[PDB]
Structures are given as C-alpha cells and as structure tokens.
Amino acid sequence: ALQYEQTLMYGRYTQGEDWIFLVLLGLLMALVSWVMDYAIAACLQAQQWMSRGLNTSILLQYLAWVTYPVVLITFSAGFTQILAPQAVGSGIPEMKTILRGVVLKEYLTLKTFIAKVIGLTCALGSGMPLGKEGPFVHIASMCAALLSKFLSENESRNTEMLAAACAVGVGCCFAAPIGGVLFSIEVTSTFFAVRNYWRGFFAATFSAFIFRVLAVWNRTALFKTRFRLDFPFDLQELPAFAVIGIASGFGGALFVYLNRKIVQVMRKQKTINRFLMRKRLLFPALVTLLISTLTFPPGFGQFMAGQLSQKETLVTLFDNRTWVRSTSQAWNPPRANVFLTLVIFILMKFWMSALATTIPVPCGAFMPVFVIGAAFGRLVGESMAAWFPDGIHTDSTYRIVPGGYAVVGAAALAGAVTHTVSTAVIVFELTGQIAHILPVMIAVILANAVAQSLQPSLYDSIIRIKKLPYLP
Amino acid sequence: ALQYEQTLMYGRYTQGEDWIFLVLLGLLMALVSWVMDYAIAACLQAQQWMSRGLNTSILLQYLAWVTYPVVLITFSAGFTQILAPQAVGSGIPEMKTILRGVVLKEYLTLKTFIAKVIGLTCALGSGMPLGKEGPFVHIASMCAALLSKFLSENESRNTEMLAAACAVGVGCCFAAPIGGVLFSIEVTSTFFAVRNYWRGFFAATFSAFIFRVLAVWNRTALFKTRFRLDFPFDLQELPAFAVIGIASGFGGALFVYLNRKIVQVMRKQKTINRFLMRKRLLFPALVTLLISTLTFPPGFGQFMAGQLSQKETLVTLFDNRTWVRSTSQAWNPPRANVFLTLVIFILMKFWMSALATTIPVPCGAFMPVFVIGAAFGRLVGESMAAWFPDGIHTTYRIVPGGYAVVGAAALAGAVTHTVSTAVIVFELTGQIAHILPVMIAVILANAVAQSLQPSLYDSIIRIKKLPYLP
Ligand SMILES: [Cl-]
Ligand SMILES: [Cl-]
C-alpha cells in the first residue's frame, strides 16, 4: 500500500442487490451535487452584494474585490490541511490508480469526504479560475465506498462498485448523462466491460431524473443554444472548423506542459521551497491576490471581460448574435473592440488557469480550459462573419453564426487537454442541440491527433508528478 | 477453420500507416453505401412506374404488385446460392465469432462480397420487411480485409482492423457517426480498448464528411424531426414513457423467441424439410407471395398503410403533427381510424418481420423492429393527446411524434441488448430534446428483456452451432 507525503503543490505517494446499490448511488450523488451548487451560488452572490453595496472610493471597491477571494482560498487550504491533506488537487489520477488494484491508505475515509465537500465549496465560491470534474469523481467514489460499507473476490465487486461511481460523478458535474459515462470510461480505464457501461448508464439516468424533479417540482441543458436548423453552416466553412481543431491540439499540449513546468520550477528552488513549506498558507494567498488584482474591472479587468462570472462568460460566448454585425457588451469596452478583448482574455486566462490549478485546495481543470476554447472559437467565428458579411455563398440568405464556432472551439481544446473524444457528446448535452455534429467531430479528432503526438494528458502528467505506479 | 453447411433458413457451421488505412476504409464504405442506396431507390421507383401504368383493372394491379417482389427475392436467393452460400442472413453473429479468434473458411472473400452486395440490393429493392445493419458490418469487414491485402505482427493488427470496420459499417448504415461506433462495441465484444474507440470515431468521421460532399455534388439527418425546444414534454408524462420501456422489454424478448421458434419448427418437421431442400427457392417465393398478398393496397393493405415505403412510413410516424386533432392520410383510410390502423400495423409487421428475416437472402433486422417500435410509440402518444386535449398541465400541448422516437429506440434496444440506440436516435433525427424520456425507456426495456431471453445475435450463434460464451 502507498501513503501520502505533503509538498507545496500536489505532494507525493510513498512506501436483486445490484439494482438497489445503483439506485441509492444515483440518489445520493444528485442530492450532494445539488447542495454544493446552492452553496457556491450563495458565495458568488455575496461577492456581488458587498461590491454593489458601496461607491465611496475605487480603493474600497479594490480592497473588497481582492479580500473576499483571498479569505475563501486561505480558509479552503487551511481547513483541508487540518482534516485530510490527501484531499488537495483533482480526484481522477488517484481513482485511476485505485481501480488498477493499488491501495492508497486513507483516500476514501469520512474525514476525506468532509475535507473535499467544504474545501471545494470555498475554492469555487471565490471566483478563481477552477473546475470541479475531478473532485466530483472522488466525492461519488466516497459515496460508493460508504454506501457499500452500509449495504454490508469482494475486491472484484469493490472495483465494479467504484467504476459506476466514477461515471455518476462526471454525469452530475456537467448534467450530461451519456457524455459523462463515456468520458469517465476514457479517463479511468484502458479496457472497459460492456456490463459496466450498462451499470454506469443506469445510475446516471436516475441522477438526471432527480435533477429534473428538483429543477421544477420544488423550485434541462446548462448552456442552451438557439441556432437555426436550416443551413446552420455551409460546406465552404469546413476548412475553418479544421483550423480550430489543429490550433487546439497545439494549445492543449502547451497547457499540460506549462502546468508541469510550474510544478518542476518551484521543486528545484532551495530557500523559497524551505520557507513556503513552513509558511504553508502564503503561496495560495499570494497567487489569489495576483489573479484577483488583474481581474479588477476599473483597472486592467475591463480589457478581459473581468466583470463576468464563469457562467455569464460561457452564456455570452454561445449567444445566437453576431457582435461585429451580464450582457454580451462586456466584450466591447469604450476604449477597445471585440477582437482585442477576446485575444487578451485568451492569453490571460491561459496562464492564470495553469497557475491556479497547482494551489493546495480541492479543484479540477475542465471548465477553465473549456471556456478558453470557447473564446478562441468566437475569435475565428467573428473573424469569418467580418470577412463574409452577406454570407459565405453567392447564391445569399444565410449568414455566418459565430456562436457555433464557439461550441466547436470549447469541445476541441478540452479534448486535447484530457486526451478524450467524448467531449463531443458532452457539448451536445450541455447545449441541448446536435446541429454542429460534423464540425465538432472534425475539430475534436484533429485536436486529439495533434496533442497525443506532443504530450501526455493532464491526468497522466499528474500521475508522474505524484510518483504513483504508472501504466503508460 | 469451421466449414459452412446449408439448411432451409440460417445454415450451420461444422468442424502513419494506421491513418492511411482508416482514411481509405472510411472513403470506400461511404462510396459503396452511396452506390447501393442509389440502386435500391431505382428498384423502388420501378414498382411505382409499374403501378401507375397498369391501372386497367384490380387483376393487372395485383399481378404487378406480387410479381415484382417475388422476382427480386427469387433472383436474390438463387444468385446467392450459386456464388457464395455463406452470404445469407446477417453478419454480426459471424463477425463476433471471428473477433474471438475462430476462423470461418471463406467468409471474407471477393465472391462473398459480390454475393452480399448484389443479393442485398435485390432483397431491399423488393417491399419486404428487411434491414441492412448486419450486412453492412459484413461488407465493411470485407472492405477492411481486401484493403489489408492491398496495402500490407501479422496477427492482431487484422483483428484491430476488423474492429474499426464493424464501427464504420454501422455508422454508414444509419448515417450516425457516434452511435454506430458505440453500438458496434456493444454487439461485437465484451471488453474493448479505449484505443479502438478512437480508431472507430476517426474512420466514421471521414465517412460522414464524404456523405456531406456527395449530398452537394449529387443530391444533416435521414429522418430529420422539427419539434419545439420549449417544454416539449412535462414531468407528469414520464410514467407514460416508462410504460413504453417496460412493454418494449416484453415485446423485444417475444421477437427473439418467435424467430427461434419458426427455425426450430421447420428443422423438426422432417417431412417438409426434405421436400423444400430438393426445391430451395420454393420457400423464399411462397413467403414473399404471402407477405405481398397481405400488403396489396386495394385489398387488406388499406388497414396497415401498405402503400407507404419503409422510409415514408418512418417519416409519417416522426412528424410534428397530432393525427387525432401522406402523414395522416395513409393511416386514416375511410373505412377505419388511426388507432385501429396502428394496432393492425404493429401485429402484422411483428410476425411478418420475424418470418422474413429467416429466408435464404442477405438481410438484417434493425429497421424492421425500429419501425414497429415507432408505431407502438405513436399509439401511446396519440392516446395521451386524445385523453389530455388541452395539454396535461392546468398550456403547451402533447407532441405525439416524440413518443414515436422513444418507442423506436426502446424496442430496438430490447431486441439487440444495447443502450446505444439512444445515441443513434439523436443522430437520425438531428434533435436531442427528448434525451431523458429516451434513456428511461431504453434502460427499462433492457432490464426486462435481459431477464427473459438472449439478444437476437446471441440466439443466432446458438441456432448456427457457433462457439458461444454467455
Ligand atoms: Cl468543471
Ligand atoms: Cl437497418
């Protein structure tokens, strides 16, 4: 068996009843997922309230803007450090190792569950560039471990039990039942049984039903698009969706390389590392103060749409309107233009997300890279709509739709970081439409073919950083 | 290697180079699939040209109606026995056996390819209730085998090339690039590498690109629906979509049992089996004459929409209109109503498809059971829309064509033991608005069917005496 060792970032490792189980697994992870999302929304509304409540100086608005996220990230790192140090980072590298028959000593205990749920809520409620896909795979796996201990060779049934929980975790994260099952298979395994695809599809369907009940009866796609079904794209637009796929493959390989290079450079410093490992809370507080200072809207933040939340940013990039011809006018500052505001957002969010993904809190990385791909897809789509203002064809009614290039760019960059093709299925379930299926599949295959030639996936790069037993 | 043996019905058996390959495999199966769909549409247009001319009397109309399909099926059966007897039936049971490392003597040869392509074109050019999912899995596997011999660790590379070919064949059959990859994995394997799911998705994307070019050079979704995006179904309707799944579970198990029972009765009836074996073409001709006599429109065919083609039938069932308040007209003859015509269609097409899939021709079974499920779904949707005329909530109305999409996916899932018929139904219709109803019905249909019977493809492995593992 292996046991956890702390360092400043990720740390290291050292040294019938089945229907009942899958229905109760689907019920628990939907209730736990709904409670976490309610508490994250309440934290983001409190930042808006304390900001909106005052106008006396730009200095008081600045101190309110930077203090709130630094306090939430300091509490997240410190509370996680006291209860369960093994709860920092994403959960996918460890669950991939546990399903391979390796034992990690205290990874699925009740203290680790309490450290994940409280630590993830404070990390996401700050507004830092953080995701939740990996943390949800570990929280679902702890629901399964505790539920199978309650519902009292069984090691094979344990592996069978944890694999269905990994499928439920991703499905609850995106509200995407089929794409979540298929993505969990691509990231947690190398060969997978058709039986465990059926057990995953069964449990994800019951969670989708509990979300549909909670969403209407006691108060659907998360980012609903409204594109036309008649001629959404021309045959002559296909070369541009192929450029998005190739450029996403080079960008997704660069992201994984940058995230590893940030970890390797601080492990090599003598005095800096030996100081910060005594001053444990100083590194997460300094990174949060840097990022929060640059997103401050009255200063530099207006040139990168810094006033939008992670949800509002993605709701605007997918809109059914052409900008070159909480609202889409955040991309159009008085002293700038749409093209410059997209280019600055892409360059700033790229290094901010690679840095924030390394701090010692519970966090994932999928939505951070998905939103960078959506902005790059808008940059190409608005550029096409500025070059062809009366449409791409001479015949002459149907104009270009830049929001459909954003959907393609989101799926292509996330596929190149994770080394998955099932981001295509996730993007149809997130948007509630399947009209861009050929553009999406072309871009996703080009992004994977380019990225796998350059780098490992994000999750395989983390396994090598943590010194876990590696199957290449 | 196992050797093939003839019988009245199914027969028996007795004792960067990877990118260049996947591009050419995706191209060839798209070109072959296009040439076949063109030839089948030309055969179905010639039946209309005979019918529009021969209006002199009911007798000249009847003789035109039954002679055309009896000639095409008799030629399909006769041509297959002369050239390659092993080409009859599906293709999935046999590829599932070849992927487990068994050798079948001549199954991927050029004479088998010619017999499969010409024989399936003539079988589907008749109005018979036949499919092509299995035949296209065999034709795609013959494209991959003939590619692998044209452009050259000799073992296992071929087994991975045949795994990608199974995915391309199902993807070209439905024009459904993701759902065809996932369905081929469920029906041909128990464990599949993530690396071969990527190889299938790559080759299927290139076939979809070549179809998009061909649809602009000559002339998004095969059965494109047009339902509203705002409240297409209510929370109170989920119990009706669940009853579709449970009823499709028993109906999908009954289809597999009846198909086996017909084959076992003929094998045991030794007095008839010896006589028909001296005269092998008599069996497909008399089944085709029986089916065509009942589908003849001026007779009994009125009461089961017998004047529609298989494509027109599915386009009428999936439309955005409510019939109780061609798309209504063929289902609403002057002597009856739409409910009675849906019930007679379901009960007649059930035994006709179970019988027709046993005859000595290249044929599949997916579109035959998908069309029965679509009608059973329409019956529940039109009954809900008749019971709740102002809508179910105290004021959007019910969409009967959305229940047809659920029933089509659920019955085809229960016959094949698959869940990927959900992904296939979104790619065939070009909408994903019914995803929760579809998944509820498909999971309920699978849990009921797997408790009662094997899959259709596992049942054929047992009938043909092939190597089996439950
Ligand atoms: Cl996320
Ligand atoms: Cl078919």
Numbering used by the authors:
A (entry chain B): 14 to 28, 88 to 224, 231 to 297, 303 to 408, 419 to 488, 490 to 566
B (entry chain A): 14 to 28, 88 to 224, 231 to 297, 303 to 408, 419 to 487, 491 to 566
Reproduce passages from the article.
CLC-2 is a voltage-gated chloride channel that contributes to electrical excitability and ion homeostasis in many different tissues. Among the nine mammalian CLC homologs, CLC-2 is uniquely activated by hyperpolarization, rather than depolarization, of the plasma membrane. All eukaryotic CLCs contain a pair of ‘cystathionine β-synthase’ (CBS) domains in their intracellular C-terminal domain (CTD).
Selected two-dimensional class averages showed a clear TM domain embedded in a detergent micelle and features indicating an intracellular domain. Further refinement revealed a well-resolved TM domain density at 2.46 Å, ‘CLC2-TM’. In the cryoEM map, clear density for the Egate residue (E205 in CLC-2) reveals it occupying the ‘down’ position, at the Scen Cl−-binding site. The pinch point of ~0.7 Å near the Egate residue is too narrow for a Cl− ion and thus indicates a closed conformational state. Another new feature of the determined CLC-2 structure is a hairpin density blocking the main Cl− pathway on the intracellular side. The hairpin structure appears to directly block the pore. CLC-2 also displays a bifurcated pore, with a secondary pathway to the intracellular side, distinct from the primary pathway common to CLC family members.
